[PDB]
Each structure stands twice: as structure tokens, then as C-alpha cells.
Design a protein around this nucleic acid. Structure first.
Lengths: 184, 183
DNA sequence: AATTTCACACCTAGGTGTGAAATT
DNA sequence: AATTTCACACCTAGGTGTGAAATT
């Protein structure tokens, strides 16, 4: 039982191969691609809460040198980001398994604004991590699952234009720019 | 302990006074004003599901005659509407009491399209009804709450221009029309 | 020098009353 | 006649990368 799969695996893979970059802003920025996963093997009638946090992919600050991401400086330990409760929580296993679970509303930021936005440090790699926590009862049951293909480097401005082109070609809110290309 | 209060009582009252009309479309229409309520006296740790449905205010088909809504023809039985599950359900009492509970996403239609939209019959009077159900509770722990100032007549097109004017004045999505008056 | 901020043009998404036209 | 439908301009609401400007 208990299986959690990554939706849109192909698009994520393409981002990984280019070394994915996620914008983080003073006000909070949404992720792209949107983290979507499928879960099964949950007690359909049990109550569960889904959580999302980000763990440091390594202890290096990265820098873009000669068109390539490169680690540098004194390596430092990085604490896992604060947790983001998926908005559908708490909810039945049946609900969680009906349709794919999407984290489309989570906002990433570089500030410590307690508005339910996940603070991350730019120029550091992160890997999203999902937690399914059983609600109620007296026994604890908690599962975690990370996806290597969702690793990215938090940034305040894109560096690799190959990524920017992938964002533009796939994110609806960036259609203006895509349209600009399809005619010029 | 338990108390469920209507938010924007003033605006609803004004609509009531003019005999509120609610547009219903083949695709579903949102309510205006938006139905919001403050609830308190729930077990902060208990799990609750909030529901919304509409009950027929009477057995008459209404018609707008000489600038007035009047009942006519023969009465019939108007069954209660299907139920709408507040999107935040199921959830803790603490969550329900923290911030006003709003039903802004409920769509009203005059077709039997199974899309989570509530079907109503136009030219009929209805009154929204909210139910708080304790998950695992008894049956007595299920309370109901209706507010007579939220009564309205379902319509496919406004009849009383005084209502149209209040809708325009207060619904942000109708600003184009309001602006068109303030110059 | 390197990285963050910011006003802005441009989209996506989707809620409104209009009023003519179509339907009952 | 009485009521419903429908394309349309015009809004609200808010997500994007751009590139100059400000900060470190």
C-alpha cells in the first residue's frame, strides 16, 4: 500500500537536467512547475493532514560562473524550512486519493514574514518533501517522501536563460513573453 | 454557548426591504451579497462539517406585476435544494470560529448540471440555511441556522431596478456600471 | 562586483449587468 | 405575452519576467 508518485514527471525532469531555479521574492513567489503528487494506500476513512517543507540539498552556497552553477566558500549546515500545511487539511484518506494533490498556493520567500510563506535562503539548493500525518486516535503514523527531480536552487533573478525559456514556455502566467517569441 | 451570526447584516437588510432578487444562470451564478457568518461556542478541538442548502420560503410562483412581486397560480411542493458542503470541511472548531465563515464559491443554477452547483427554480422564493455537523457527534449536535433577511426570489434577469442599483453599487465585479454613473 | 528590489506591461482567470434575440 | 439565453465590454484579482535602480 502507501504510495506517493510525482505528477508531471517529464517536465520536472527537463528542469532538473538544466539545474532548476526557483524565484523567491520579498512578497512570496509561487513554484513552477507546481508540485503535484498522487497518493494511495491511505485508510479511506482515516483523517490525514498533508505537509510540505524544504530540506537543504547540500551545505553549499552556489554561484553562477561562466554559465554554470558552481559551489563555493565555507560550507554551512542548513536547517529544513518551516512546514506548509496543505490547504485541504485535515481530510479523509479517500479525499487525498481521489484527485492528485497539488501544492499550487504555496509561496516561497527570502524574508521572515509570518504569512504562511516558506522562507528559503537564495543561492542554496533545496528539495521539497511531503508528509502525510494521521489525525486523531492515540497512535502516531507519519510518512515522508522526497523527489530528487524537484531539486532547485532558490534565486532572486534567473541566471540560466535555458530555464527562463522553459518557465516561459510552460507557465500560463508567462504567456505574454511566449507569445512575444512566437511572432518575433 | 453556540452562536451563529450574519455578517453584513445592514446590506442584507436593505436588500430584504426591496425584496432581494438572485440571478441564476444556465452555468451557475454566485450570490450577492456573499453569505458570511461568525460562529462561536463550538468545541475548539472537535471536527465539524458545515453545510448550506436553500429552503422554499413559500409555495408560490412569483411574478413581477406593476412594479411589485406578487404570488399567483396554484401552489406546489418545492423540495429542499441539494446540499453544498463548505469547501473547508471537515475541519476543527477552532478553524471555524477563527475567521468569518463565507460561502462565496457556491453557484446557483436553474439546470440539473451535477457540478456541485445548487439548482433552484426561478420565480420562487428561497431562504439559505446553514448546518453545522459534528463529525462523530450525535444528531442533536447538528444545528441549523436561517436568517430571514437573506430571503430572495430566484430570477434569470432583474425586475426591480432598485435591486440592480444596489448590486451595482456594492458588487466589485459590477464596477464598470457603477463608474458609468459617477461621472 | 554581486545580488536584490521594484514599477511596469501583459497575461491568466473568471464575475457582472447589458440588451437584443431566442425560446416557451 | 413572459421568461430565458447569449455574446460582449469591462471589471476584479493576481501571477510573470523584464531591466533599470538600489542595496550589499
Amino acid at each position: 500500500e502507501l504510495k506517493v508518485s510525482l505528477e508531471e514527471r517529464d517536465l520536472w525532469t527537463r528542469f532538473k537536467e538544466l539545474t532548476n531555479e526557483m524565484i523567491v521574492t520579498k512578497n512570496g513567489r509561487r513554484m513552477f512547475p507546481v508540485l503535484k503528487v498522487s497518493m494511495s494506500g491511505l485508510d479511506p476513512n482515516a483523517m490525514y493532514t498533508v505537509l510540505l517543507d524544504f530540506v537543504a540539498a547540500d551545505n553549499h552556497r552556489w554561484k553562477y560562473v561562466n554559465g554554470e552553477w558552481v559551489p563555493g566558500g565555507k560550507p554551512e549546515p542548513q536547517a529544513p524550512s518551516c512546514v506548509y500545511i496543505h490547504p485541504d487539511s485535515p481530510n479523509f484518506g479517500a479525499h487525498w486519493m481521489k484527485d492528485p494533490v497539488s501544492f499550487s498556493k504555496v509561496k516561497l520567500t527570502n524574508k521572515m514574514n509570518g504569512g504562511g510563506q516558506i522562507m528559503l535562503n537564495s543561492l542554496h539548493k533545496y528539495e521539497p518533501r511531503i508528509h502525510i500525518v494521521r489525525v486523531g486516535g492515540t497512535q502516531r503514523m507519519i510518512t515522508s517522501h522526497s523527489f530528487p527531480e524537484t531539486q532547485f536552487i532558490a534565486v532572486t533573478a534567473y541566471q540560466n536563460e535555458e530555464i527562463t525559456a522553459l518557465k516561459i514556455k510552460h507557465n500560463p502566467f508567462a504567456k505574454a513573453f511566449l507569445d512575444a517569441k512566437e511572432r518575433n
